[PDB]
A paper describes a structure:
PaGT3, a uridine diphosphate glycosyltransferase (UGT) from Phytolacca americana, is known for its ability to glycosylate capsaicinoids and other phenolic compounds. PaGT3 adopts a GT-B-fold structure that is highly conserved among UGTs. However, the acceptor-binding pocket in PaGT3 is hydrophobic and large, and is surrounded by longer loops. The larger acceptor-binding pocket in PaGT3 allows the enzyme to bind a range of compounds, while the flexibility of the longer loops possibly plays a role in accommodating the acceptors in the binding pocket according to their shape and size.
We also determined the crystal structure of PaGT3 with UDP-2FGlc and kaempferol at 1.85 Å resolution to understand the poor regioselectivity in the glycosylation of acceptors with multiple possible glycosylation sites. Compared with the apo-PaGT3 structure, the loop Gly78–Gly91 shifts towards the acceptor-binding pocket in the kaempferol-bound structure. The crystal structure of PaGT3 with UDP-2FGlc and kaempferol is similar to the capsaicin-complexed structure, with an r.m.s.d. of 0.34 Å for 855 Cα atoms. The electron density of kaempferol in both molecules of the enzyme clearly indicates that ring A faces towards the inner side of the acceptor-binding pocket. Superposition of the kaempferol molecules in molecules A and B of the enzyme shows that the binding positions of the two kaempferol molecules are different. Interestingly, the 3-OH groups on kaempferol are at distances of 2.6 and 2.9 Å from the catalytic His20 in molecules A and B of PaGT3, respectively. However, the distances between 3-OH of kaempferol and the C1 atom in the 2FGlc moieties of UDP-2FGlc in molecules A and B of PaGT3 are 5.5 and 3.8 Å, respectively. As PaGT3 glycosylates kaempferol to form kaempferol 3-O-glucoside as the major product, the binding orientation of kaempferol in molecule B is likely to be a close representation of the Michaelis complex that forms the major product. The binding of kaempferol in PaGT3 protomers in the asymmetric unit is an indication that sugar-acceptor molecules can bind in different orientations in the acceptor-binding pocket. On the other hand, the binding of kaempferol is assisted by a network of hydrogen bonds provided by water molecules, which could be due to the smaller size of kaempferol compared with the size of the acceptor-binding pocket. The crystal structure of PaGT3 with kaempferol and UDP-2FGlc shows that smaller molecules can bind in different positions/conformations due to the large acceptor-binding pocket of the enzyme.
Residue numbers in the entry: 7 to 54, 64 to 254, 270 to 319, 331 to 484
The structure:
């Protein structure tokens, strides 16, 4: 019986798909163990036999609050750099656990480049998992290597991405200031080691499907030389609420869903602009979130608009017939869920690799419309708030704009292809079989 150990970073966006991968492996009669920390254990226990191993996270040692065991909670350069020091200090526990258990494979988070050598100490192959699209993997590497943002003179000047079979235009504002304004050696070295681990390790597991982005599934393997397996969307593996009853009464494709993911850190002025745009648009909506609402808002929109304050059942909402569009930050799990539900998206990237995912959705898949956000940053400065008019424009365009029906038709195709990829005989099913067979024969 093969044993594969999974080691995601403590971020919801990596933890949930890593659990889905562990489940996909477990369904093939592979023993799957997931490493996490105490304050994150519930996330897996609730979601779940896949075994959990708890490591101690040295928060105090790196100057974090004891309760800061997840990446979303480390807001700001100081806290973020401390968090990465902290996770780097898990290496001793990882190596002790590997020596003790001797698994056949380690699937480790992109943020752990050192995991490669930790596994090599015991002749164990290591796979990298990023939780993002082939397109983002390729675009980030081409930007890192060719630095096409050096050839510009203004924040808004458009440059093309080198080498790609599509002409993808981007601007400096869409890149972290740490890369183009005031170089911090720390982030740059971090990114270098991450991208290098893709070639130094045994290979890369990708939560995507070949038919979704074939040019980039190929580019990653050919022009960039990585060994990769596409096994996603991994969430389809394992496959009421008051808002769903609320939706049952409504016209097909008539409601807009708005949600900014797990890393959502949104300020009151921004929410205020969103509220005004939603009211002015006349569109029915489910919005996942006085000081941030127009007075009388929730009563004025009753029956047409719903604000969800807690966790929303995002997949169940997107797959409800009444939901016709998705305003998203273009985190890859949300983007994939929109694709699998066949729901067109208004793209609102914030940080990380979300601006690359936005390019994939709008220019290549052609299933979305941009809201107009073009500034990369962890937190929103009040001077960068996206205004009511842009938001209303996007809300109208995604429902009744030019090519809106075409976007709906294209997304329906991708929905079909996604389900086909994961069923027996599909490309993702097949690549998972291929990967597991390769792991079973490793010497
Ligand atoms: O109210 C809610 C809110 C969310 N969810 C679910 O949480 C998931 C969100 O993952 P997503 O990629 O969109 O957000 P996030 O964790 O911020 O992205 C980081 O992780 C991503 C993956 O690596 C990365 O692409 C991105 O750049 C990072 F910022 C997604 O599966 C939703 O369905 C829900 O069910 N109910
Ligand atoms: O792929 C990526 C990714 O998954 C994550 C991520 C970041 C924060 C989270 O909370 C969860 C995930 O960030 C990234 C940052 C990059 O510069 C490049 C990437 O490719 C990713
Ligand atoms: K090359």
């Amino acid at each position: 019986q093969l044993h594969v150990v999974f080691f995601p970073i403590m971020a919801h966006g990596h933890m949930i798909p890593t659990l889905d991968i562990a489940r996909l492996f477990a369904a093939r009669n592979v023993r799957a163990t997931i490493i996490t920390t105490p304050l994150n254990a519930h996330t897996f226990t609730k979601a779940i036999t896949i075994h959990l191993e708890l490591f101690k996270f040295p928060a105090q040692d790196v100057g974090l609050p004891e309760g800061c065991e997840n990446l979303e909670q480390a807001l700001g350069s100081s806290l973020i750099e401390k968090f990465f020091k902290g996770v780097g200090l898990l290496r001793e526990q990882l190596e002790a656990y590997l020596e003790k258990t001797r698994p056949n494979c380690l699937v480790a988070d992109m943020f752990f480049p050192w995991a490669t050598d930790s596994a090599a100490k015991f002749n164990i192959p290591r796979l990298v998992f990023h939780g993002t699209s082939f397109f983002s993997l390729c675009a980030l590497e081409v930007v890192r290597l060719y630095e096409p943002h050096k050839n510009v003179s203004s924040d808004e000047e458009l440059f093309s991405l080198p080498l790609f079979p599509h002409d993808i235009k981007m601007m400096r504002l869409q890149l972290p200031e740490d890369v183009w304004k005031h170089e911090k050696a720390e982030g740059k070295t971090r990114l270098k080691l991450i991208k290098e681990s893709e070639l130094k390790s045994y290979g890369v597991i990708v939560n995507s499907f070949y038919e979704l982005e074939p040019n980039y599934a190929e580019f990653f393997r050919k022009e960039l030389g990585r060994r990769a397996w596409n096994i996603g969307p991994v969430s389809l593996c394992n496959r009421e609420h008051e808002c769903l009853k609320w939706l049952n009464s409504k016209k097909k494709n008539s409601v807009i869903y708005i949600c900014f993911g797990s890393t959502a850190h949104q300020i009151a002025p921004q929410l205020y602009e969103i509220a005004m745009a939603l009211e002015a648009s006349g569109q029915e909506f489910i919005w996942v979130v006085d000081s941030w609402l127009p007075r009388g808002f929730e009563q004025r929109v009753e029956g047409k608009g719903l604000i969800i304050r807690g966790w929303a059942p995002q997949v169940l909402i997107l797959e409800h017939e009444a939901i016709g569009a998705f305003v998203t930050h273009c985190g890859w799990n949300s983007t994939l869920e929109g694709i699998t539900a066949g729901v067109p998206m208004v793209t609102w990237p914030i940080f990380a690799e979300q601006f690359y995912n936005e390019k994939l959705v709008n220019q290549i898949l052609k299933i979305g419309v941009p809201v107009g956000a073009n500034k990369w940053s962890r937190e929103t400065s009040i001077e960068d708030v996206i205004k009511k008019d842009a938001i209303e424009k996007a809300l109208r365009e995604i429902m009744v704009g030019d090519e809106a029906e075409e976007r709906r038709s294209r997304a329906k195709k991708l929905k079909e292809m996604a389900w086909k990829a994961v069923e027996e005989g599909g490309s993702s099913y097949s690549d998972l079989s291929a990967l597991i067979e390769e792991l079973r024969g490793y010497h």
